Structure formats: C-alpha cells, structure tokens
Amino acid sequence: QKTPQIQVYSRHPPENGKPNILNCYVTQFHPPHIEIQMLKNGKKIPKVEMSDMSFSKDWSFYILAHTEFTPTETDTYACRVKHASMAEPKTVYWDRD
Amino acid sequence: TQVEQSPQSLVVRQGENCVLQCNYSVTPDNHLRWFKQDTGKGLVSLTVLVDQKDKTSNGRYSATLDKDAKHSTLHITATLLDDTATYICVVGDRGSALGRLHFGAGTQLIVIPDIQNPDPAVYQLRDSKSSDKSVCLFTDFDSQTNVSQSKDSDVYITDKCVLDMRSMDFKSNSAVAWSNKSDFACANAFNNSIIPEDTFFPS
Amino acid sequence: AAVTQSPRNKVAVTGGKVTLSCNQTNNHNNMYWYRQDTGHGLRLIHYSYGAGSTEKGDIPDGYKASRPSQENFSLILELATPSQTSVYFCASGDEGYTQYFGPGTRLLVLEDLRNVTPPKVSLFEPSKAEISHTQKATLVCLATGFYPDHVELSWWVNGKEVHSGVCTDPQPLKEQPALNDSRYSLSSRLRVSATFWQNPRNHFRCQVQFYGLSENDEWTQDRAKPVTQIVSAEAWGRA
Amino acid sequence: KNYTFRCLQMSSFANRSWSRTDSVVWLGDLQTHRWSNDSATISFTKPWSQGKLSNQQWEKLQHMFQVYRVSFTRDIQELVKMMSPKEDYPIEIQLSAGCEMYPGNASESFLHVAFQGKYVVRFWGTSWQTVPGAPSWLDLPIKVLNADQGTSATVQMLLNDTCPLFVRGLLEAGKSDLEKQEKPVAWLSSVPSSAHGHRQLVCHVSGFYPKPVWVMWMRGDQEQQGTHRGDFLPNADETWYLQATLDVEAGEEAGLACRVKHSSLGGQDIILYW
Ligand SMILES: CCCCCCCC(=O)N[C@@H](CO[C@H]1O[C@H](CO)[C@H](O)[C@H](O)[C@H]1O)[C@H](O)[C@H](O)CCCCCCCCCCCCc1ccccc1
Ligand SMILES: *[C@@H]1O[C@H](CO[C@@H]2O[C@@H](C)[C@@H](O)[C@@H](O)[C@@H]2O)[C@@H](O[C@@H]2O[C@H](CO)[C@@H](O)[C@H](O)[C@H]2NC(C)=O)[C@H](O)[C@H]1NC(C)=O
Ligand SMILES: *[C@@H]1O[C@H](CO)[C@@H](O[C@@H]2O[C@H](CO)[C@@H](O)[C@H](O)[C@H]2NC(C)=O)[C@H](O)[C@H]1NC(C)=O
Ligand SMILES: CCCCCCCCCCCCCCCC(=O)O
Ligand SMILES: *[C@@H]1O[C@H](CO)[C@@H](O)[C@H](O)[C@H]1NC(C)=O
Missing domain, CATH: 3.30.500.10 (MHC class I-like antigen recognition-like)
Known part of the structure; x- marks a missing residue:
C-alpha cells in the first residue's frame, strides 16, 4: 500500500479574473482505486476532466485531474483525495505563490 | 450449445465410407478431439487436431480441422461392424489445464454387417438343468430379414443380434423366442415375422 | 496415465446418500467430475486443483465434491434424486490440457426399492440339429425376473471370460409391458465350433452380475433381501 | 532518437x-x-x-x-x-x-x-x-x-x-x-520558508514540449547553486510543467532572475527579473 502525493498547479500564469486551467496531479499510490475531487470554496466543481490512469516505471499509479477556473482575490481552490492508504481524505489547497 | 454434431445418427453398410461433422462456436478454440464411445463403455480418443488448418489420420480414421470456419470432419474409411458406436467431438478452449472442455452430444453410427453365406434356421435348445424348459433360436438369416415382437404377450422375442466368431472370420444374426404357453413350439414362434422362404425347421 | 472409478454400477433410493469415487496414481494435481445424459455432451459438475481444493463446475447443484488426497476425488450425493440417474465420468490431468477419463459409473436412483429382484439364470445347450447342419454350436443364456435393469452378462469358458462369438441383447425386455414396474429378461448367445462344444473338458458358464441393494439398505418384506450379487448357470461340453 | x-x-x-x-x-x-x-x-x-x-x-x-x-x-x-x-x-x-x-x-x-x-x-x-x-x-x-x-x-x-x-x-x-516544439512560459512568485527570516522564490515554467529543459535562478551571470528543480508535471494538453525554487534571505530578492533554456525558443532564452 502506497500513499498519494498531490500537486496542484495552474496551466497558465494566474491572473485574477482571467480564465485558466487548474491541474491536480495525483501520484505514487497503490492500489489503483481512488476518488479525486477538485473544490472551489470547499464545494465540488462539476465539470472536472480526468486523464486515463497510468503507471510509472516503478509500478506506482498516477492520474491528472483538471478543470477550468478563474482565480480571484477571495475564491479558494483545492484537490481532495480519498484512498485506502489514508484514514481521512487529504486536501491540498492551490496556493498561487 | 457451443458444439454441434451432424448427422445426429446414420446407418451404413460394411465397407462404405462415412463423414461426421462437428461445428462449434467455442472461443478460443485451442484444439479439437474426436472420441469413440461403444455402447455402455468409455471414451476412446481417436485423434486430436491443434492447428489452424489441420489434417490427421489414424488407420481407417482421418480428420480435418478449419479453425476459421470452426468446422471439423471425421472420415471413417471401409466401415466395419465394430465401428458401430457414438462419435463425440470435444473442443478445448486452452492449451493447458486452465481450459474447459466443450462436448458435443455425439453422432450415433450403425454399421450393418455383411452376411456372406445365409443359412436361416429355427433351432430348439433345452435348459441344462430342467429338460422340459426350452428356447427357440432363429439364426443365420441375412440383415434384410426383420424380426417382429410376438402377437401373444406371454411369448417373448428378442431383437436381432449379430455375433462375430473372430478366429473363423464368421458373423451371424440371431433372435431368441421363449414362452410358458401350451400353444408354443418353435415351428410357430416367429410367425409374426416375415422370415425367409427356405428357413430350415428341423424334425 | 490411468483413472479408476468405484462403484461401476449403483442402484440407490431417493433421499439416500451415494458416494462416487475416483482414484488415480498419476500424481495429477487436477481432477474433474462429469455426467453424461442422452441429448447432451458431458457436463462438468465439480473439479479440483489439489488435495483440499474443490471448485464448482457448470452443474454443481445437488452434489458435493471431496478431494481428501492427491489420489482420490469423490462425488457425494447427500440426498439422491431421480434426476441424478446418469453415467458419471471422472478425469484427471497435470498442467497440460489433456484429461484422462475413467471408465464411467452408471447410477440409477429409484423412488422406492420394493420391486428390486435378482435374476434367475438358465443356460440352454446347443441343438444337435444346429451341430449337424452348420458344424457350429450356439449356447443361449437367459436372465429372467429381475428389476431394475442394471445387469452385466458375461461368458466364461474354463474360468476365463470369452468375448469372441458372443452377442447379448442391447437391452432387457419387459416381462409384463402393461405393468408399472415390470420385471425384465435378457438373453445372450455364445457360438462356438461343434468340436469345442463336443469336448467334455470345456466348462461353459453364463454369469449375470446384478446390482441391487447394499448390506446397509433397509428391507421390510418377507422375501430374501435383493442385494447386489452374481447368479450363474453352467454346463460341460459333450459328444 | x-x-x-x-x-x-x-x-x-x-x-x-x-x-x-x-x-x-x-x-x-x-x-x-x-x-x-x-x-x-x-x-x-x-x-x-x-x-x-x-x-x-x-x-x-x-x-x-x-x-x-x-x-x-x-x-x-x-x-x-x-x-x-x-x-x-x-x-x-x-x-x-x-x-x-x-x-x-x-x-x-x-x-x-x-x-x-x-x-x-x-x-x-x-x-x-x-x-x-x-x-x-x-x-x-x-x-x-x-x-x-x-x-x-x-x-x-x-x-x-x-x-x-x-x-x-x-x-x-x-x-x-x-x-512538435511548444514554448515554455514562465512566471515568478514567493512563499515563506521552513525557517523564519528566509523566503522561497519560485520560478514556474509551463507549456513546453519536448521534455528536456534548463531552468536556473541567477544573479546576473552567476548560477545560484541552491536552485532546486521539482519534478516534471503534466499539463492536460500534452505539454509539461516544471518549477525551480530558491531559498533566499528576505531583502536579497532584488537582482535575482530566472532563466529558461528550451529547444523551442531557438536560443532566445527567457529571463525573468524579480
Ligand atoms: C499481453 C500478452 C498478450 C498475449 C496473449 C495472446 C494469446 C492469448 O490471448 N492467450 C490466451 C488464450 O489462449 C488460448 O487461445 C489461443 C487462441 O486464441 C490459443 O489457442 C492458446 O493456445 C489457448 O490457450 C491465454 O488464455 C493466456 O493464458 C491469457 C493470459 C496471458 C498473459 C498472462 C500474464 C502472466 C500472468 C501472471 C500471473 C501471476 C500472478 C498470479 C498468479 C496466480 C494467481 C494470481 C496471480
Ligand atoms: C523470439 O526471440 C527470442 C530471443 O529474444 C529475446 O526474448 C524475446 C521474447 C524478446 O524479449 C527479445 O527482445 C529478447 O532478446 C528467441 O528465443 C531463443 O530461441 C532459441 C530457439 O528457439 C533458444 O535456443 C534461445 O535460448 C532463445 N533465447 C533466449 C534468450 O531465451 C525466440 O525463439 C524468438 N521466437 C520467434 C518465433 O522468433
Ligand atoms: C469489465 O468488462 C467485462 C467484460 O465486458 C465485464 O464482464 C461482463 O459483465 C457483464 C455485466 O455484468 C456480464 O453479463 C458478462 O458476462 C461479463 N462478460 C464477460 C466476458 O465476462 C465486467 O463486468 C466489467 N467490469 C466492471 C467492473 O464493469
Ligand atoms: C505484446 C505487446 C507488445 C506488442 C504490441 C504491438 C501492437 C500494439 C497495439 C496497441 C494495442 C494495445 C492493447 C492493450 C492490450 C492489453 O494489454 O490489454
Ligand atoms: C465484489 O467486489 C465488488 C467491488 O468492490 C463489491 O461491490 C461486491 O459487493 C463484491 N461482490 C461479492 C459477491 O462479494
């Protein structure tokens, strides 16, 4: 059993009020069953696309989630992951800096 | 079912050739085996075909397999009485013990033997212990003759039956009739049957 | 690579327990049980990949399997029913695809055993008229009055079984065809040369192995218990 | 190849x-x-x-x-x-x-x-x-x-x-x-470090293909040995993302630049001054 790493990052330089893509890259997990949510202000974003799950040379799985977003002064964005290796879901917040 | 055989049954005469078919939908199809099963006996493997387009032979038996068509034929050349049996097609879906076998329901073959020198007769045979009890034996008729059941329900008549005296190369048909009725004698036992004109009835 | 089955033939009652055994000394890990019924190919009931493994096949319902050792694989019918009347085949194999089949076991499950009856057996000696007409001699054996129809008829000359010159009726005939549980008769012929029958050192015997009750089956009728048994009749050749 | x-x-x-x-x-x-x-x-x-x-x-x-x-x-x-x-x-x-x-x-x-x-x-x-x-x-x-x-x-x-x-x-x-050649775009940012007194600068580089790329924090012509490249992370459009961090003293940010070399730029490096 292996614990998921989660990395949250924008496709383009983030600019307040400008449309962009937010990525959540989940890696290093085993077994492959996983649930990934991207959140705006703690609420589930609806239109989230997922890449096909794949795995690396070391046999650990990875998958990329992404969604359209427009960053603002006040809105928070996060990626929440549920996996059997963790007792509780893990949440990583997008921090533009 | 996944494995179908044709014909369901057939009757041929000794010396004639015949062809039996197996068609299947089994996937994947690793190999196909033909078994011979004599009545009330077990399974005797005749051949196994393994290639995409295969041909095998084993004495008087030959077979083909075409995996594209999912079709096999078994050919029996110059049939003999002993070919009388059920012939079963089996398709194995793996090249290992992980496989399942898919069995056809079989084709029943009957081969009518050649009776070389008919000598139809009705003989009376007596019980080894009680001199008074007897049976009537209708024997040595050719395979054109049919033996009918009796009109009287207290007269018993068996179906015909061919025996093979192997060391003399000799075959003969026979049927047996017996009864307790007072009206029963061998002169009259097979009256319900069309028996040969020249049938020997000894004194 | 050989496989054996026991028993070879069995008559049982509805609700009774029946065990069918299969033995192989090939050190094969894998064994398989099938039944064969008219209109169907063999159908897989249970199989096993080793001692302690049993796995359900295509038609497992009503059967339990047991693999106590590498050698033995049993099929257990805890509550036998008439639908289990069949011919059962066991097979074994190693990691290869070949399955090596046993000789088969015939099982008949009756509703009730009350009509079960062993045969009488009579041997009818060759006609002197046949001998003078053909220089051949046909013996006839007749098994009569038996129920059910599970019998094996065989011919023996001087204590060794003969097959050449034999033909036995493909099935028994009903003695009372109008009746519910008619008894059966079966006939067989053995034909030999007149000189063989004429030799007084030749001892001919017709044997019928009858399959009926076991020692353990209950019996409440006044007549003798119709157990599995051999009945035979014999005669010596003569000039 | x-x-x-x-x-x-x-x-x-x-x-x-x-x-x-x-x-x-x-x-x-x-x-x-x-x-x-x-x-x-x-x-x-x-x-x-x-x-x-x-x-x-x-x-x-x-x-x-x-x-x-x-x-x-x-x-x-x-x-x-x-x-x-x-x-x-x-x-x-x-x-x-x-x-x-x-x-x-x-x-x-x-x-x-x-x-x-x-x-x-x-x-x-x-x-x-x-x-x-x-x-x-x-x-x-x-x-x-x-x-x-x-x-x-x-x-x-x-x-x-x-x-x-x-x-x-x-x-x-x-x-x-x-x-295909796709160009990186870069941008800069800063966070507080594991130790108080320090800051961690981040040079973000995104949208480049193929994978091979060079990213270094620099003071004029001097390569800052402390530069730490992260992992290559995928974008959804089959381009790549990479960031290069540098832990520095608050106050020392002025004069630092992030330089990016990539095959798609044809020798026109990206240079971003803090
Ligand atoms: C990426 C590999 C693809 C190659 C497979 C191509 C062949 C194939 O599909 N083989 C199948 C079917 O084979 C039958 O049909 C065939 C005709 O179509 C033939 O006639 C052939 O002769 C039959 O046998 C066959 O079923 C293979 O066994 C399928 C699996 C092949 C890959 C197995 C990978 C190794 C697994 C190791 C497991 C170890 C872990 C494990 C062990 C035990 C328990 C649990 C886990
Ligand atoms: C296929 O090639 C192999 C040898 O190649 C290696 O194994 C392959 C599966 C693949 O991974 C390659 O890149 C490897 O370099 C042949 O195997 C040899 O076969 C001969 C006789 O058939 C045998 O004596 C050798 O020991 C085998 N070599 C090894 C290393 O085991 C194989 O026969 C080829 N098959 C066909 C159909 O071309
Ligand atoms: C993965 O795909 C396989 C093959 O299509 C699915 O197995 C089939 O499932 C259906 C619906 O339950 C059954 O009716 C078929 O018998 C199965 N087909 C075979 C060839 O076995 C399987 O359900 C799929 N798995 C999941 C989790 O959806
Ligand atoms: C044996 C695999 C290597 C050789 C394959 C050459 C053909 C490639 C075609 C791509 C199909 C991918 C199928 C995935 C099959 C699977 O593993 O389930
Ligand atoms: C098998 O696994 C699935 C998926 O985890 C589960 O939902 C299902 O209930 C299980 N089935 C059985 C028969 O245990």
Whole structure:
C-alpha cells in the first residue's frame, strides 16, 4: 500500500479574473482505486476532466485531474483525495505563490 | 450449445465410407478431439487436431480441422461392424489445464454387417438343468430379414443380434423366442415375422 | 496415465446418500467430475486443483465434491434424486490440457426399492440339429425376473471370460409391458465350433452380475433381501 | 532518437466475481491508445495511432487482444482457485509490454508483470519465468502458463516481430506530433520558508514540449547553486510543467532572475527579473 502525493498547479500564469486551467496531479499510490475531487470554496466543481490512469516505471499509479477556473482575490481552490492508504481524505489547497 | 454434431445418427453398410461433422462456436478454440464411445463403455480418443488448418489420420480414421470456419470432419474409411458406436467431438478452449472442455452430444453410427453365406434356421435348445424348459433360436438369416415382437404377450422375442466368431472370420444374426404357453413350439414362434422362404425347421 | 472409478454400477433410493469415487496414481494435481445424459455432451459438475481444493463446475447443484488426497476425488450425493440417474465420468490431468477419463459409473436412483429382484439364470445347450447342419454350436443364456435393469452378462469358458462369438441383447425386455414396474429378461448367445462344444473338458458358464441393494439398505418384506450379487448357470461340453 | 513504446495494463480483481482491466499505450510521453474495460474495442487517441497497418491487419490484431482480455480474466480467476488458500482477493496485476526502438533496425522487446505492485514475472525468449525475489508459489502458475504452446508462439511473434514493425510505422505516421516544439512560459512568485527570516522564490515554467529543459535562478551571470528543480508535471494538453525554487534571505530578492533554456525558443532564452 502506497500513499498519494498531490500537486496542484495552474496551466497558465494566474491572473485574477482571467480564465485558466487548474491541474491536480495525483501520484505514487497503490492500489489503483481512488476518488479525486477538485473544490472551489470547499464545494465540488462539476465539470472536472480526468486523464486515463497510468503507471510509472516503478509500478506506482498516477492520474491528472483538471478543470477550468478563474482565480480571484477571495475564491479558494483545492484537490481532495480519498484512498485506502489514508484514514481521512487529504486536501491540498492551490496556493498561487 | 457451443458444439454441434451432424448427422445426429446414420446407418451404413460394411465397407462404405462415412463423414461426421462437428461445428462449434467455442472461443478460443485451442484444439479439437474426436472420441469413440461403444455402447455402455468409455471414451476412446481417436485423434486430436491443434492447428489452424489441420489434417490427421489414424488407420481407417482421418480428420480435418478449419479453425476459421470452426468446422471439423471425421472420415471413417471401409466401415466395419465394430465401428458401430457414438462419435463425440470435444473442443478445448486452452492449451493447458486452465481450459474447459466443450462436448458435443455425439453422432450415433450403425454399421450393418455383411452376411456372406445365409443359412436361416429355427433351432430348439433345452435348459441344462430342467429338460422340459426350452428356447427357440432363429439364426443365420441375412440383415434384410426383420424380426417382429410376438402377437401373444406371454411369448417373448428378442431383437436381432449379430455375433462375430473372430478366429473363423464368421458373423451371424440371431433372435431368441421363449414362452410358458401350451400353444408354443418353435415351428410357430416367429410367425409374426416375415422370415425367409427356405428357413430350415428341423424334425 | 490411468483413472479408476468405484462403484461401476449403483442402484440407490431417493433421499439416500451415494458416494462416487475416483482414484488415480498419476500424481495429477487436477481432477474433474462429469455426467453424461442422452441429448447432451458431458457436463462438468465439480473439479479440483489439489488435495483440499474443490471448485464448482457448470452443474454443481445437488452434489458435493471431496478431494481428501492427491489420489482420490469423490462425488457425494447427500440426498439422491431421480434426476441424478446418469453415467458419471471422472478425469484427471497435470498442467497440460489433456484429461484422462475413467471408465464411467452408471447410477440409477429409484423412488422406492420394493420391486428390486435378482435374476434367475438358465443356460440352454446347443441343438444337435444346429451341430449337424452348420458344424457350429450356439449356447443361449437367459436372465429372467429381475428389476431394475442394471445387469452385466458375461461368458466364461474354463474360468476365463470369452468375448469372441458372443452377442447379448442391447437391452432387457419387459416381462409384463402393461405393468408399472415390470420385471425384465435378457438373453445372450455364445457360438462356438461343434468340436469345442463336443469336448467334455470345456466348462461353459453364463454369469449375470446384478446390482441391487447394499448390506446397509433397509428391507421390510418377507422375501430374501435383493442385494447386489452374481447368479450363474453352467454346463460341460459333450459328444 | 530512442523511443520506448509501452502498453500498460492494470487489472483489479476484487473478489471471485468482480474485475476490470484497463489499458493505456504510450510512444515516448505521448498517449496513442486507450482501452477501457467498458469498451469492446481499443480506442485511438491520435489520428496516427493505427500506424502503417492496414484496416485488415489492425482488425486482426484487435481481435487477438479482444480474445486475450476475456481469456486473461478467466485465467487469473482459475489461477487463484489453483493456488488457494495461499493467495486470495483482492488482486492487482499490472503488465508493461512493448519495445524500445534504437537506430537502424535495432530494438529490444519486453513483457513484465507485477503482482500486488511488485515485478514478479516476465516473458523471456520462449517462455514465462519468475525474476529474482519472486515468491516460490509462482512456480506452479509458471508451469501452467508454460504448458500453453499456442500462447507462447503468439507472444513470441508479438514481441519479436509485431512490436518493432508496428512501432516503426507509428514513428513515421506520428512524426509531426513527436517532433512538435511548444514554448515554455514562465512566471515568478514567493512563499515563506521552513525557517523564519528566509523566503522561497519560485520560478514556474509551463507549456513546453519536448521534455528536456534548463531552468536556473541567477544573479546576473552567476548560477545560484541552491536552485532546486521539482519534478516534471503534466499539463492536460500534452505539454509539461516544471518549477525551480530558491531559498533566499528576505531583502536579497532584488537582482535575482530566472532563466529558461528550451529547444523551442531557438536560443532566445527567457529571463525573468524579480
Ligand atoms: C499481453 C500478452 C498478450 C498475449 C496473449 C495472446 C494469446 C492469448 O490471448 N492467450 C490466451 C488464450 O489462449 C488460448 O487461445 C489461443 C487462441 O486464441 C490459443 O489457442 C492458446 O493456445 C489457448 O490457450 C491465454 O488464455 C493466456 O493464458 C491469457 C493470459 C496471458 C498473459 C498472462 C500474464 C502472466 C500472468 C501472471 C500471473 C501471476 C500472478 C498470479 C498468479 C496466480 C494467481 C494470481 C496471480
Ligand atoms: C523470439 O526471440 C527470442 C530471443 O529474444 C529475446 O526474448 C524475446 C521474447 C524478446 O524479449 C527479445 O527482445 C529478447 O532478446 C528467441 O528465443 C531463443 O530461441 C532459441 C530457439 O528457439 C533458444 O535456443 C534461445 O535460448 C532463445 N533465447 C533466449 C534468450 O531465451 C525466440 O525463439 C524468438 N521466437 C520467434 C518465433 O522468433
Ligand atoms: C469489465 O468488462 C467485462 C467484460 O465486458 C465485464 O464482464 C461482463 O459483465 C457483464 C455485466 O455484468 C456480464 O453479463 C458478462 O458476462 C461479463 N462478460 C464477460 C466476458 O465476462 C465486467 O463486468 C466489467 N467490469 C466492471 C467492473 O464493469
Ligand atoms: C505484446 C505487446 C507488445 C506488442 C504490441 C504491438 C501492437 C500494439 C497495439 C496497441 C494495442 C494495445 C492493447 C492493450 C492490450 C492489453 O494489454 O490489454
Ligand atoms: C465484489 O467486489 C465488488 C467491488 O468492490 C463489491 O461491490 C461486491 O459487493 C463484491 N461482490 C461479492 C459477491 O462479494
């Protein structure tokens, strides 16, 4: 059993009020069953696309989630992951800096 | 079912050739085996075909397999009485013990033997212990003759039956009739049957 | 690579327990049980990949399997029913695809055993008229009055079984065809040369192995218990 | 120059009755196929994913895989029964199969199998074998798998002949995507460090293809040895993302610049001054 790493990052330089893509890259997990949510202000974003799950040379799985977003002064964005290796879901917040 | 055989049954005469078919939908199809099963006996493997387009032979038996068509034929050349049996097609879906076998329901073959020198007769045979009890034996008729059941329900008549005296190369048909009725004698036992004109009835 | 089955033939009652055994000394890990019924190919009931493994096949319902050792694989019918009347085949194999089949076991499950009856057996000696007409001699054996129809008829000359010159009726005939549980008769012929029958050192015997009750089956009728048994009749050749 | 073609299969067996098998196919770092458990057929994820195979050759190959997927599923379930009670569900199986393509007509094929996340089995030469460190109980599955001569002949053909031939055609057909150049765009930011007094500068670089790239924090012409490159992270559009951090003293930010070199820029480096 292996614990998921989660990395949250924008496709383009983030600019307040400008449309962009937010990525959540989940890696290093085993077994492959996983649930990934991207959140705006703690609420589930609806239109989230997922890449096909794949795995690396070391046999650990990875998958990329992404969604359209427009960053603002006040809105928070996060990626929440549920996996059997963790007792509780893990949440990583997008921090533009 | 996944494995179908044709014909369901057939009757041929000794010396004639015949062809039996197996068609299947089994996937994947690793190999196909033909078994011979004599009545009330077990399974005797005749051949196994393994290639995409295969041909095998084993004495008087030959077979083909075409995996594209999912079709096999078994050919029996110059049939003999002993070919009388059920012939079963089996398709194995793996090249290992992980496989399942898919069995056809079989084709029943009957081969009518050649009776070389008919000598139809009705003989009376007596019980080894009680001199008074007897049976009537209708024997040595050719395979054109049919033996009918009796009109009287207290007269018993068996179906015909061919025996093979192997060391003399000799075959003969026979049927047996017996009864307790007072009206029963061998002169009259097979009256319900069309028996040969020249049938020997000894004194 | 050989496989054996026991028993070879069995008559049982509805609700009774029946065990069918299969033995192989090939050190094969894998064994398989099938039944064969008219209109169907063999159908897989249970199989096993080793001692302690049993796995359900295509038609497992009503059967339990047991693999106590590498050698033995049993099929257990805890509550036998008439639908289990069949011919059962066991097979074994190693990691290869070949399955090596046993000789088969015939099982008949009756509703009730009350009509079960062993045969009488009579041997009818060759006609002197046949001998003078053909220089051949046909013996006839007749098994009569038996129920059910599970019998094996065989011919023996001087204590060794003969097959050449034999033909036995493909099935028994009903003695009372109008009746519910008619008894059966079966006939067989053995034909030999007149000189063989004429030799007084030749001892001919017709044997019928009858399959009926076991020692353990209950019996409440006044007549003798119709157990599995051999009945035979014999005669010596003569000039 | 060198490209690895990888067919990646992931199969999960939850219990005796539930399972799924999903595959993805990669040529280098570009996805060429997907085969979802819910799909009867393999999906192309590029216009050129059929390579130079005719429709008939592709149909035949796909049919072989369709038979494989069903057969593989039953085989694992039967192997579980065979080794019972040694191994039990849940079971995870991964396969990595393909070929690496070298200059000329040179290539090497592989078929590696992992069980519960550990590499245990490969196909090598003409048969299946376990690899060093694999458990002994696998010798029975291997014996059973190696009894299947038809599968051995097919796998030999796939690895020795089909893979390199197919991939040579893929490389031709996909040349323009494989050789694409996409430009990095960079941007700067800063966070508080693990220690109070320090700050951590971040140089973000995104949208570049292909993967090789150079990113360094710099003071004029002096490369800052403290620069720490993160991992290459994918963007959803088959470009890459990378960031290079530098821990510095609050106040020292002025004069620092992030410089990016990439093949797509044609020697016009990106230089971002703080
Ligand atoms: C990526 C590999 C693809 C190659 C497979 C191509 C051949 C194939 O599909 N073989 C199938 C079907 O084979 C039959 O039909 C065939 C005709 O179509 C033949 O006639 C052939 O002779 C039959 O046998 C066959 O069923 C294979 O066994 C399928 C699986 C092949 C890959 C197995 C990978 C190794 C698994 C190791 C498991 C180890 C872990 C484990 C062990 C035990 C329990 C649990 C886990
Ligand atoms: C296929 O090629 C192999 C040898 O190649 C290696 O194994 C392949 C599966 C693949 O991974 C390659 O890139 C590897 O380099 C042949 O195997 C040899 O076969 C001969 C006789 O058949 C035998 O004596 C050798 O020991 C085998 N070599 C090894 C290393 O085991 C195989 O025969 C080829 N099959 C066909 C059909 O071309
Ligand atoms: C993965 O795909 C397989 C094959 O399509 C699915 O197995 C089939 O499931 C259906 C619906 O339950 C059954 O009727 C079929 O018998 C199965 N087909 C075969 C060939 O076994 C399987 O359900 C899929 N798995 C998941 C989790 O969706
Ligand atoms: C044996 C694999 C290597 C050789 C394959 C050459 C043909 C590649 C075609 C791509 C199809 C991908 C199918 C995935 C099959 C699976 O593993 O489930
Ligand atoms: C098998 O696994 C699936 C998926 O985890 C589960 O939902 C299902 O209930 C299980 N089935 C059985 C028969 O245990």
